[PDB]
């Protein structure tokens, strides 16, 4: 019942430092301030958490392990309590995103620490009496069509199989005909992700030869089989849990780069999904404030396939990867203005009527 928004301001690249563009993103500790190079207007931003990675010697450094121990481990702890969990990710191409979720071989990200602590606590908590099972699915969303990233298509060309969403009455919604493979060791997970990302939809526009035009969901599902009756072998209460980590595409604005084609039709749906997702997050944050409010989930696909993982006794989180430079300032604020959606205590009024607590 939370949003737990967060940012991450990367350090300069090598090309940027040789070209020597300006630093503009600063920090007043936790609160952030940014200063347009025209000396004209300053913009302020507050979040529940702020990660700084620009220069090492500054206190409050935000390493990869800091990211894990501050964001991810609570999701795992609440998964073990029998609830579900979701995590988001936002960033335009170049804002240091894939280095954050996946990481590198010598510099891990968030995914591997998550999965390895998963296996560790499995091998710890597990007994001869109790067990743990774990399955995976990994799919994508392109023009609001669902596609499965965990398969190889025929020798034909673009004959991608579009699947269908269906609402179960009890277990909640799901996708029809989705591969649900089994895993026990990280060597399987890396293999599956490598089959995945190479099938994801990518194109070349004015920003880079390699960008992302589709959302990508990575779902794990876990089962506690602590079901052992005293009289004999009989099962009482399995517990299912749904862990979810999604990489979202950027909200490219169609002005500097004329799209004139299918790329426009992708961008528009991508924009729509992001707007609806922010709208949902604001409503859930308000619901956490004790105020009953509607939670529009059927207005998009990525939410309708993730209803039960962002409501009730669930837990959520967001992370926003932005850039420090001035040559990527216009795409930078758009991220931060997209991640202001906590609105915890900002000028709430007060009216109350409560009496007759007596004879």
């Amino acid at each position: 019942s939370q949003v737990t928004v967060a940012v991450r301001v990367r350090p300069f690249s090598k090309r940027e430092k040789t070209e020597k563009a300006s630093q503009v993103v600063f920090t007043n500790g936790e609160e952030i301030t940014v200063e347009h190079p025209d000396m004209k207007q300053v913009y302020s931003f507050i979040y529940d958490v702020s990660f700084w990675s620009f220069d090492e010697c500054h206190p409050g450094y935000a390493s990869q392990t800091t990211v894990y121990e501050t964001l991810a481990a609570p999701l795992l702890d609440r998964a073990f309590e029998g609830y579900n969990t979701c995590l988001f990710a936002y960033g335009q191409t170049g804002s240091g995103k894939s280095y954050t979720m996946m990481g590198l071989n010598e510099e891990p990200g968030i995914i591997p620490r998550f999965c390895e602590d998963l296996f560790a606590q499995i091998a710890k908590k597990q007994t001869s009496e109790v067990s743990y099972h774990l399955e995976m699915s990994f799919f994508e969303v392109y023009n609001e069509k669902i596609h499965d990233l965990l398969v190889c298509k025929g020798e034909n060309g673009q004959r991608k199989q579009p699947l269908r969403a269906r609402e179960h009455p009890v277990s909640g919604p799901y996708v029809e005909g989705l591969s649900m493979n089994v895993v026990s060791s990280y060597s399987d997970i890396q293999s599956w992700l490598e089959l995945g990302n190479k099938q994801r939809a990518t194109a070349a526009t004015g920003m880079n030869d390699k960008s992302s035009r589709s959302h990508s969901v990575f779902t794990l599902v876990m089962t506690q089989t602590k079901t052992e009756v005293v009289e004999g072998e009989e099962h009482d209460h399995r517990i299912t849990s749904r862990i979810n980590l999604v990489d979202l595409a950027g909200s490219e604005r169609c002005s500097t780069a004329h799209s004139s084609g299918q790329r426009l039709k992708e961008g528009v749906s991508i924009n729509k999904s992001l707007l609806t997702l922010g709208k949902v997050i604001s409503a859930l944050s308000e619901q956490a404030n004790g105020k009953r409010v509607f939670i529009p989930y059927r207005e998009s696909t990525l939410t309708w396939l993730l209803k039960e993982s962002l409501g009730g006794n669930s837990k959520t989180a967001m992370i926003a990867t932005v850039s420090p430079a001035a040559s990527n300032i216009e795409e930078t604020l758009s991220t931060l203005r997209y991640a202001t959606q906590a609105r915890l205590i900002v000028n709430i009024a007060k009216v109350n009527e409560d009496m007759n607590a007596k004879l």
């Binding site: 269906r166 609402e167 179960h168 009455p169 409010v293 509607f294 529009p296 059927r298 207005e299 009024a349 009216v351």
Partner: protein, 431 residues
């Protein structure tokens, strides 16, 4: 040039089509043969918005008639104005639906739909530009619901940037003309709110009361009700068809009237409706029409809006008039009746004017509203629905043609979620 296609399904849509063309032909000056007998040159400048052309200036229409039983078609063809429609468009089959939604969406309708698509692509590609399509069906039977919704889905999957505007005769509270109305209507609403840009709900009991109280008729047959529906269809799209002072289009209505994509179910209405012996004792002016429009016993929605709040309003006027009276009277509506409107939008009203009125009236007006009250319809159907699903009354006629008990639940949950979505913007909450 803007161009529209009229799809026309069921035993209700085809009679409506006969009347609709019997009205638009008289507004554009066409005879049952095809020829032109008009009086003004404005009357064919934009005839292509609904019609096509021919060899000897016969001005043939654009119409696609998608029944499954030939009865309505064979009643239309041997009729007053059923001699012009392109006989390659009298599409039909056999083995009618039988007031079953499964026999129009899954098994039989698929053995006819591809022909209809081949006709639609023909009637589209021969247009210079396109603005949208139309579809008149009922909800309560098989053909108009199933076949119409399948066509909606496939057409929107083909041409999604264009508009799809559906005029639907939804069921009534008291006297149903079918026993399986809730099931069909609910399974259709599961496929209309997702795949449509604007739907204008219509009911017959409201039309009966509008024909009894206002017009003081004694023997109202369906001709008079379809006459009203045609009068609405016609004044919804004058802005594309004739000049004006503040023109409009269907996209403007579908934009301004639809804050969020789901809540596009609208209450229609027409003015000046008066008795045949009582037009002596009235003044054809703007405020009287504005009074008659927002009145509840003139709306075709079977639903007093005074039970709820107005979200957004579209009033299309016709006649040589003044815009100051329009703006002032709409202001006084926005002001004197604030509790019937929404506050997080300041301006819950827009306008549109054509300076070329109908054939025999100085002025006229048409009304479209997006309210919270229309949930009372859906809230009824669901209460009608589940009582039958909880005991599975008429289920097997729907499972014997390729279904399960899950899709019904999907439709019910979607409709109930929409009810809650409408309720979210109704209760008078103060910050």
């Amino acid at each position: 040039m803007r161009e529209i296609v009229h799809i026309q399904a069921g035993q209700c849509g085809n009679q409506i089509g006969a009347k609709f063309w019997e009205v638009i032909s008289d507004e554009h000056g066409i005879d049952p043969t095809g020829s032109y007998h008009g009086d003004s040159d404005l009357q064919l400048e934009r005839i292509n918005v609904y019609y096509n052309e021919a060899t000897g200036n016969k001005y043939v229409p654009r119409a696609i008639l998608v029944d499954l039983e030939p009865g309505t078609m064979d009643s239309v063809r041997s009729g007053p104005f059923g001699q012009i429609f392109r006989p390659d468009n009298f599409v039909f089959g056999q083995s009618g639906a039988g007031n079953n939604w499964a026999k129009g969406h899954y098994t039989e309708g698929a053995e006819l739909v591809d022909s209809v698509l081949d006709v639609v692509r023909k009637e589209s590609e021969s247009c210079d530009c396109l603005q949208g399509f139309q579809l008149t069906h009922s909800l309560g039977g098989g053909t108009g619901s199933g076949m119409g919704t399948l066509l909606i889905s496939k057409i929107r999957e083909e041409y999604p940037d264009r508009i799809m505007n559906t005029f639907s005769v939804m069921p009534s509270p008291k006297v149903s003309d079918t026993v399986v109305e809730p099931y069909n209507a609910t399974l259709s609403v599961h496929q209309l709110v997702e795949n449509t840009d604007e739907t204008y709900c219509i009911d017959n009991e409201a039309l009966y009361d509008i024909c009894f109280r206002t017009l003081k008729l004694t023997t109202p047959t369906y001709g008079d009700l379809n006459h009203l529906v045609s009068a609405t269809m016609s004044g919804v799209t004058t802005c594309l068809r004739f000049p004006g002072q503040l023109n409009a289009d269907l996209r403007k209505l579908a934009v301004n009237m639809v804050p969020f994509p789901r809540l596009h179910f609208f209450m229609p209405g027409f003015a000046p409706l008066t008795s045949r012996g009582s037009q002596q004792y009235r003044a054809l002016t703007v405020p009287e029409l504005t009074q008659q429009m927002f009145d509840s016993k003139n709306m075709m929605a079977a639903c007093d809006p005074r039970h709820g709040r107005y979200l957004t309003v579209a009033a299309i006027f016709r006649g040589r008039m003044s815009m100051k009276e329009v703006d002032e009277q709409m202001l006084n509506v926005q002001n004197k009746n604030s509790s019937y409107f929404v506050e997080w939008i300041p301006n819950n009203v827009k306008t549109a004017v054509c300076d070329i009125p109908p054939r025999g009236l100085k002025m006229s007006a048409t009304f479209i509203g997006n309210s919270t009250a229309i949930q009372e319809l859906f809230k009824r159907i669901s209460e009608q629905f589940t009582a039958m699903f909880r005991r599975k009354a008429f289920l097997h006629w729907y499972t014997g043609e390729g279904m399960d008990e899950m899709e019904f639940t999907e439709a019910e949950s979607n409709m109930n979620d929409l009810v809650s979505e409408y309720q979210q913007y109704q209760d008078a909450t103060a910050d």
